[PDB]
Amino acid sequence: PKSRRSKVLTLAQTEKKGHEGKAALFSGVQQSLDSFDYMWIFDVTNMRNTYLKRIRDDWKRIFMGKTKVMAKALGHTPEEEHAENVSKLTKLLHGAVGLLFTVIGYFESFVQNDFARAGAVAPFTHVIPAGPVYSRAGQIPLTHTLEPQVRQLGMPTVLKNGVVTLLADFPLCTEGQQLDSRQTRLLKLFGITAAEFKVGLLGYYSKKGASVEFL
Amino acid sequence: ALRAQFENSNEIGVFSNLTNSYALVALGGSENFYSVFEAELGDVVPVVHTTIGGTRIIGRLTCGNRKGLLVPSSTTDNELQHLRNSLPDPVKIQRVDERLSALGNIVACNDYVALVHPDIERETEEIIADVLDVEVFRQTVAGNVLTGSYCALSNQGALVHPRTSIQEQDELSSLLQVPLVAGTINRGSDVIGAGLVVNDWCAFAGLDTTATELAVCESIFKLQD
Amino acid sequence: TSGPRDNNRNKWAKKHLKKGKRAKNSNFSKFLKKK
Amino acid sequence: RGRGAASGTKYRMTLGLPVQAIMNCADNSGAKNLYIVSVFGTGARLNRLPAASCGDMVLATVKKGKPDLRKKIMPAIVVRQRKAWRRKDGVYLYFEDNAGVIVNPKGEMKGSAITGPVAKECADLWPRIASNAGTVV
Amino acid sequence: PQNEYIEESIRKHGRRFDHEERKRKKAAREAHDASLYAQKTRGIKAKLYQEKRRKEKIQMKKTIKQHEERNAKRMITKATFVKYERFIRPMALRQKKANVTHKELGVTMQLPIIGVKKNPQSPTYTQLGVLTKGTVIEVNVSELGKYAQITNNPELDGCVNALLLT
Amino acid sequence: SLKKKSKRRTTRLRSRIEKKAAESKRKQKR
RNA sequence: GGAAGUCGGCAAAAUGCCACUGUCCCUAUCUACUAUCUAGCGAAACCACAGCCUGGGGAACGGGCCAGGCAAAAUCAGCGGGGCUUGUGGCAGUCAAGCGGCGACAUUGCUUUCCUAUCAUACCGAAGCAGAAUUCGGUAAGCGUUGGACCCACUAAUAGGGACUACUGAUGAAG
RNA sequence: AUCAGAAGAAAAGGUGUUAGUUCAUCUAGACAGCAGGACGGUGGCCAUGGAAGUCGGAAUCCGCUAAGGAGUGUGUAA
DSSP states (O other), rough: OOOOOOOOOOOOOOOOOTTHHHHHEEEEEEHHHHHSSOOOOOOOOOOOHHHHHHHHHHHOBBOOTTHHHHHHOOOTTTOOSSSSSHHHHHHOSSSSSOBBBOOOOHHHOOOBBOOTTSBBBBBBOEEEEEEOOOOTSSSOOOOOOOOOHHHHHOEEEEEEEEEEESOOOOEEEEESSSHHHHHHHHTTTOOOOOOOOOOOOOOOOTTTBBOOOOO | OOOBBTBSSSSSSSEEESSSSSSESSSSSHHHHHHHHHHHHTTTOOOEEESSSSOOHHHHOOEOOOEEEEEEEEEEEEHHHHHHHHOOOOOOEEOOOOSSHHHHHEEEEEEEEEEOOOOOOOOHHHHHHHHHEEEOOOBBBBBOOHHHHHHOSSSOOEEEOSSHHHHHHHHHHHHSSSOOOOOOBBTBBOHHHHHHOOOSSSSEETTOOOOHHHHHHHHHHOOOO | OOOOOOOHHHHHHHTTTTTTHHHHHHHHHHHOOOO | OTTOOSSSSSOOOOOOOEEEEEEEEESSSSSSSEEEEEEOOOOTTTTTTOOOOTTEHHHHHOOSSOTTSSSOEEEEEEOHHHHHHHHESOOEESSSOOOEEBBBBSOOOOSSBBSSSEEEEHHHHHHHHHHHHHHEE | OOHHHHHHHHHHHHHHHHHHHHHHHHHHHHHHHHHHHHHHHHHHHHHHHHHHHHHHHHHHHHHHHHHHHHOOOBBHHHBBOOOOOOSBBOOOBBEEEEEEOOOEEETEEEEEEEEEEOSSSSHHHHHHHHHOOTEEEEEOOSSOOOEEOOOHHHHOOOEEEEEEOO | OOSSOOOSHHHHHHHHHHHHHHHHHHHOOO
């Protein structure tokens, strides 16, 4: 009766609160601004939830929600914001940044490696030798039992007698090249931890000092 | 031994003839059949791509040995002229104006002894001895007059019906001065002459012949050396 | 049975007409043509 | 079972033995008479009684014979023909009597020695009959 | 070949090269194919698709409805049962058993027809035992001698579907 | 025509269409 | 070849289960006569008027009406022609899209030519479809759908159904 | 409209079109499109050769939350 895109439906029963969720995030941001101390601005990075879970463990609460939504709730103008000189803070307040309560040394030093994300530059020039596939670049003393991965690769790989075989040498990634989605997904099947989680501690919105530096 | 078939027929004794001096195969049909014969005897004996009376059944329509070859009166002058041109000098070729035209079905011969369907005419017996230079015995195999089709015979052995009695096998072998075996071919096909073609050094059998018979022919005809 | 009105019978008929099968008709008329 | 194991292919020739015709038994299997009841490989020709020829296969009943071979309709090969038929060579042939042999559907004949002349056509087609033939012209 | 030989072949040689592309595109275009099928087809095949789409539409409506709930001649021309018998009663029209459904129990019970109580059509039909709509018939209810009313037409349906008078 | 039938309804159909429409209206009235 | 034709030894043939036979497969040839043409003789029945076809005209739709297709003298000989309906039962309860108590599907209880709606041949899609063989479905009526008493074989298959003028040849006046 | 148009099947269906009616989010970035995360107790419990959310029976709970359903499908013997 009308040409329109058919919408897929499922039964998750986990629909987000939408406006209520945004209000809850704003309330949490206000409480985090009302927290005791340590005035951190750092929430997430390219790392998975495991790094976030480990970071949350070493604290007695890192959370940002929708970026620039907490800043909007606080208000860019100093009149709306409860803090001082937040007009310049809001400009710096962007991306995955959130308050915490547990620090500086751990964030500066402890940087665990993790699988790379798209857009970055490869730390090296990974090359996949031809023949049987090597999951960990020939570190197995990486079996050839990857029966379903052969159909799921798409790259120059054919199944020979139940063994995945790359007919031609396929360079997985090269240093200085932007990490494509296909390159990142292909590297996911391998042990390429070409990333390092970082943090941002430029300033601290202390209750008394109110000096959030731009370092 | 070899497993080979003409077209898709196992009876290669009908569609071809083979002796110690030459090989006659059917025409116009499968040249793959000519290739099979040429693959084992091409450089040793001539392989004639011939016909008898405009038919492909030349194997059952002729009888011959290393010395002479016979054809029925039904053969044309053109086909007879063809055979003599292709065949070499030491092999003599003759037209046998004889009672039962199918010479292959009535006469099975080697270089020294021949077995004939008793119902042949005396002049035919005389010329066979004159041409083939063999002794002629007007006997029967398994009680059947068609000696040529039921007794595949060569210089080093012979095969007959499994039905024929042991005393009959001993009589035939002693009168032939050669070892004899009562065997089968082509999974119960009792026409041994029509399924197996034999010379003193090579033998061909139908594709449907099982390994047990092929071992038997190998033993009796001693092709291993 | 494939009928002579079949487009693929007609297609392969064409390719026979483009071998030496038709060459023995091209120069074959040239025989008389030089007489 | 029709046209089965008959080696090559048969040229067209005149039709001699229609349905319900009597032929002599040609082999020494033990039979005397055969009765044609049906002919293999006959199309939808309206009001055409199927007919047989040399080298053809027909369902036959042993009209005169020992009771064991009787009572079982089974195929038979017409080995001879009385109607004049012309070879592709051009010569015209015909025999005294219509004769047929008793054969299993596969192609091996049930006899041991056939009697009298054999049609050169059927000897060409049927190697089994050519294996068990006495004289062919 | 033994057991799951194609599964072994898939395992040891892989499936078709473009198989995922073909099935994904087939999974992509049936929405257009369904509308083309619904608009171009005519006749019985159209009508069957008509009724089966309503089946799936109503079904999908109900399963989704369940979802927020989870989130929240002198002869007898009729059937007969067994001078006075002037007409011919065929053995074909003869009826002996009936499907009597109890009112309170609500179970269709196979009960033999003990007899016909009264035929509302005419006394002659009751005398001849002609089964018709609204005719009272008595049947044995030992396994359940009680009356019942025919809720069907035995002439057309061919089965004596009746409801117990209880 | 171009169709599988004739669009001109024969005068029988022009006759009995209206009366059967009238019987339909009477049925709703009843 | 010798009852396969036909409900069938109807009629001939064989003489004055066997055997014979053109009943048939399948007709062909030959003879006489009618037949046609020529010279002569020469009716009657019948006749409102006439004679191309499709659809429609309340009916009876027709040869006249309407809308079309069309339509070129005179003749000779054969042949007689003249908005239904379908593939899916009946009783009872339960929902319940909803409307105004019903309530839709679902659930539970028991008992010659033409048509395509294609059998075969062509192609096609699906199926644990390995090969072969097969099943179901789609396009498709170009082309076939047999021979003998429900049967018994052949066959690729032996699918289901509707129903004076014209026709066929032969001359022919004329721009 | 691949046979459009100039009360009987009829109720229903159409990724055909055009208007309306009633609800939804939306520069606290709407829909879609993309990159990434889509977790850790835990391979929860009976069930079994092998069942790890996805052969199968009840809950189906929790820490981080901005989110990870004792799991939406494909799939793997697992």
